[PDB]
Amino acid sequence: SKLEAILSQEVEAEIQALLQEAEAKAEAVKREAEEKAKALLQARERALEAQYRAALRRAESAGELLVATARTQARGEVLEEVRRRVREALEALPQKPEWPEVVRKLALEALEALPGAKALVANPEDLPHLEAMARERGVELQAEPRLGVRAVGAEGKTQVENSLLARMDRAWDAMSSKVAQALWG
């Protein structure tokens, strides 16, 4: 029957269009993925690349802080040594053949700062030396505080002194600057 023959070819020709519809609707699915994956893995390469350099920045920034400390660590080992030698130098002064000469220098120097003045102080490390302006001036030498000289004036008043080590903490603290340049010039 040729009439239904045409119904076959027609229906069958419809089959051929359904399958093709599917194929393209599959190919687009296949290609939807190909892009979908490409677009995420690109995005996860990005995030990791930052997770690299910015990590390395904080690593590089660390090393400079270890080098900076390292250097500051070294300068302290030096600067403290220069401190000891100034102290050692001030502590080896008494047994040197130049110590009595210095004695009344600071004794007189303070004596000027206290114009009134009743008496003065000092160790047997020094005091005995005070005979020069012990004969002259006031003549009061009584007390014991061993590196430095003090004074008491206005009968009592505020008893002003002058410690030899108090000169260091001032003068060291001041031109600790001229010293650091002199060192690393």
Add this chain to the structure above:
Amino acid sequence: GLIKSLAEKEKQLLERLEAAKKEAEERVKRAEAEAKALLEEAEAKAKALEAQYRERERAETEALLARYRERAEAEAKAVREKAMARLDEAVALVLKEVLP
């Protein structure tokens, strides 16, 4: 009269069309599976990437310390030595200020 002819042929066609639509829809259910597989295994590739991103980072950051620290050991010493030489004078200056 034959009725069946026109009423049976009318079935085979309908059930071949039925059969067409499904086997069609499977090819999509097939590609839908591949659509997952291609994503799952893309999740994998990137996972393997992280490895290198953390690992190469390890090896270089571990190396970066070596190079920086051994420059810390080097530069710190070379600043001691700079002082060492000129050191007598530092005291010479400090001692002179306090003396008078």
